[PDB]
Symmetry: D3
Subunit: 250 residues, 6 copies
């Protein structure tokens, strides 16, 4: 019955934890890694499944791309009792030796977004819940993935805010010119688009959140991710996030 | 070349230089069928893409999802493929008493309560539509018989606190947005939505033509609940209007 | 009764609800004399005020001086006296190679490189004209036979560093404005001026209708000096155009 | 070189390195005639320019109009022509109850509620006068029999909302400025005016010496619109003061 | 090389790559003596520096003084001399009702209410500890039998207005900080202190590992000035914890 | 009755209403001993506090530590105990070629490159000294025989990146501060230090009188190293000057 997600509290069957990928197509994939996956609804960028993990209900809900739709999903799920949010995403590596297929667990986000400011002023840290970050690190490491813990630059755009130049105008606004090297020099691991919003919103709202993402491109090489390695990277990331969910449930 | 998110090529667009960009993927086919020879091109994520023909010219219809960030991707990727004019259509909630359900709003400028616009131009830059698009939208909206409002829209990266909604999980609105609705109301702002600041700033600073038209389906200031019929007519009218606005742009 | 800076009363305006607001006090009489029965009302500081009649309706002509701050005083004080529509007229320097001397620019939005706009609305708010005024100005400008550009203007609180001029006493431009002309050019900005951001933001947030039209008398990217006749023609056209825009605005 | 707005050459200034810069063009001749051999040089827009001699030294008197933007033009163009010291003589509103109409205030630093100052230095930079100028102004004020206050001035790009005036057309003051007058009062700020932030920042960051002395024509503890009755006397005192301050700078 | 402020050389540190950095110079010896072979190295200004050995590895203990600025000097100079890991042990005021005097807080991120953090990274950058350090601090805290909280710390450049204390000389708090404590409380912020924003931002953007654990010496829901009675024992627990955290980092 | 950090009471100050506030606790006794009957009051953290008598009036000497945050604490707590005038003394490095080692700088305004100033007044507020204090400091400095520079100081929350030092652990400086030294040099800024913005803004907005005077002990632009004797004389002169400035401030 929530405005956008089209699900009710009853639909969630007691779920207090959500796995929130960006891509609607990833929802079923994640759900099927758990028990009794059930399709709930799909409207706009929000595809929602429920499943069971060690006897506990878990909701899987896509967020779409971007802080704005992410913020809607988190809010509406929180309205229905969800308190823990595990983003599983795709990401571009900023550092040269973070490779495609590696997993990145965000310890803090550079807030290159707008939606985070709708929850807390810029000085507030876009930081994950410590339990979630711990669970994500553990799940990733236990899985045998190559895992990096660190800061993520989280941008409201895919193109200029991640300093991509292979674009229609080929221009990047002054603020973002040279930004990728600046973040690289500052030890920032990766770019994605939703963690600043997610982490700030949750950390300032009594919700627990984290972000783990599979590296699909190394930005020291090129701007557009290769298709060939997307599926395997995604499969690894969802294995990891489901295990992180297990760790959060008990 | 296939663009990364939209999954279409320039050839797929058959020479289209104009796109109608609703937020909701499900509305794409509904818009396309108002035109000739609608063809599904792709659906990935919150991007459903059709092509159609309007007065013999190819037009793209592509959903953006909610929010500037995903909108910015659709606009960019379509621009790479030759699209130069972008018409946003949707429905919206008004914050002015004189704006009724069923009315149309054509955005003359947006309050940039978003983040993505800043990735194209600093905050000082105006989130303003192309004048031809705004003009075509006004004319199309008027020709539909609806009352049309030209004015400023507050474009928020959130549905909840940025639109000063308190009926939420925390019930809190960050300091920045406390009292903001009344502020915008007093400044004559017509409505809230969530994509126009990004769309208009991006396009106006990138040599792209953009505008936004929206049917009003609710009013924050009115207790009355619009009936099903009026809402349905408003949704249908909004897309008839945007298609007619596209026709005016292609003339 | 008598407004403090302008030195006029509501009665002096003879029911005028529209003002034409050039920057230069010396231009006021010229504009007034394009209309019927021009009457000198007052001159104080940068504020020369005339009244005239256009199609039987009273119109105020009031100079603003250079800059948002003095403009904001004139607009406010005229608004206190019942003026609701403000038509900025002037001449301007373009920054786009395709914009030629003699062309007209009608502002669709302004880059807020000023301070006074912030005294009316936070930076996120668009410095946007009233749609009717912009439409009337476009129509008047097009009917003049001039080439007309609708687009964004960069509105600077300075003539020198904020317009990235280096031929100055210090030869320095603060970091904020270094490379800024090229940035605005690449963003499609048509010209620099010094009052529109304030005017448009103030009016758009205060229930007043405003717009700006300017004849192009120089182009920052061109080396040719326009001849005296061309400059005179352009000045004359700019004020003929604003008076015609006023005519179109009158009910 | 003939400077663009002021219409004077360096030779016209007869070696003047100091300018007295009132806001009101009508005040220029009044200042000039307190000195020797006053000559009218030019009048264009809000810029009326005289030269005179003080203890055998050339001094320029040049109005700035109201606002940082027009002020910044005058200062720049005078600086191009060799002027290095700028003494603003203005009118001001006191925001401390103990200050009386007719008192003089010499600004020791300005709250930068303007836009033009940012075109010279980022906001962190202090809008501070040259210490010699401030010292000369204080001494000149005391020696002229004036009651003088030294302190911080809030320097606003608007007369109305940025000085938290409510007796206005809309009666609204943007969020930023709501409660601002009491906040500045609580912080010990003495007065409001409109040009000192721009003048002082521009000069302090450009190797020019500047100061601002202003006659208190209103106390905001009582009212928002200055009484007419005391304007002339206050102005006459202020110009006596500023000429003597100029004398002290030339010694 | 002898670093400018700390007055120590790389050789003095005997290969230390980890520093414990309390704010209070008097706390340095107290920390060092929990380790093996503590040796005084230097004391200059707020910087008292000892070396000691923990499980055979050299560890530096260096006070920072109060504030990001002096902290930033200590961290930089220690980093020049090979230190890569920095463990702040401090005192803090809790702002959550459930947190008790004597509890420990391990900062998972800081609200950057400081200025020095901006000298290392723009405000968007998260003031976040190194994950290993935060992990080590939590475990150390738990293993000491103390009550520990993981969460966000508001890190202020002032003790008084930036922590919204009103029992002060002026009794005023600048607009920005009015209501700020409640705002942070509502956002789940655990405590106030003064150095973590600077420390964490500097380190996280400079390839250094940092964390902050602080003993709660006051709950701000109760009072503004910490009671003297519980200071010593709260300090004693905090330093036991930080030394054990160091042990875990060196393992 | 006993302030939290300084560990002194009002009675301890013996009616002192003026404090000399060096940064270095070790310098406190030296300053106190220039006056009569110096008495040690307290030492805690970076705060060493003495009292002495100057022309029969009690004067406090209190170190502040490095940086605005610790300074703000000392000023506040002394103000709680009746201190109203604060004279910052120290030595500094100049960034202008014309400023020589041994010269004195009296700050007329500070560039607010700090955070703590914002906890007292928004950025637009000028970090300006009290005019009487600045006057007294200028007079004392000039009477010493030193060359005295009245001008703007850049007040940084860091010693390293905020003063654009590259000889550091990371060897880089955040974008904001890249090229900043040359920018301040070109804007006429005399020197960097680390406390004046906080001190001056706090005091000027809190009804306290403050100023800063410093002896120049090095010049960023000169490769020549001053000898021990010159540095010693400059250090000595700086504190003699501040004591004489105190004398001038007293009644
Ligand atoms: Cl990517
Ligand atoms: Cl006033
Ligand atoms: K979306
Ligand atoms: Na003016
Ligand atoms: Na300190």
């Amino acid at each position: 019955t929530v405005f956008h997600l089209g699900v009710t509290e009853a639909d969630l069957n007691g779920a207090t934890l959500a796995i929130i990928p960006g891509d609607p197509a990833r929802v079923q994939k994640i759900a099927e890694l758990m028990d009794n996956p059930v399709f709930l609804a799909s409207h706009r960028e929000y595809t929602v499944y429920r499943a069971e993990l060690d006897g506990q209900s878990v909701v899987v809900c896509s967020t779409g791309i971007g802080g704005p739709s992410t913020s809607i999903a988190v809010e509406e799920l929180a309205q229905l009792g969800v308190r823990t949010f595990l983003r599983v995403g795709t990401t571009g590596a900023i550092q040269p030796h973070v490779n495609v297929g590696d997993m990145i667990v965000t310890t803090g986000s550079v807030r290159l977004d707008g939606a985070s400011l709708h929850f807390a002023p810029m000085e507030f840290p876009a930081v994950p819940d410590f339990d979630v970050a711990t669970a994500m690190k553990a799940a990733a490491q236990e899985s045998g993935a190559t895992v990096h813990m660190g800061v993520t630059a989280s941008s409201d755009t895919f193109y200029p805010g991640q300093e991509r130049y292979d674009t229609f105008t080929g221009r990047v606004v002054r603020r973002f010119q040279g930004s990728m090297k600046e973040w690289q020099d500052m030890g920032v691991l990766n770019f994605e688009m939703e963690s600043a919003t997610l982490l700030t919103m949750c950390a300032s709202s009594g919700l627990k959140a984290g972000c783990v993402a599979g590296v699909i491109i190394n930005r020291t090489q090129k701007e557009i991710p290769d298709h060939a390695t997307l599926k395997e990277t995604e499969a690894r990331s969802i294995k990891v996030v489901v295990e992180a969910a297990r760790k959060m449930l008990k």
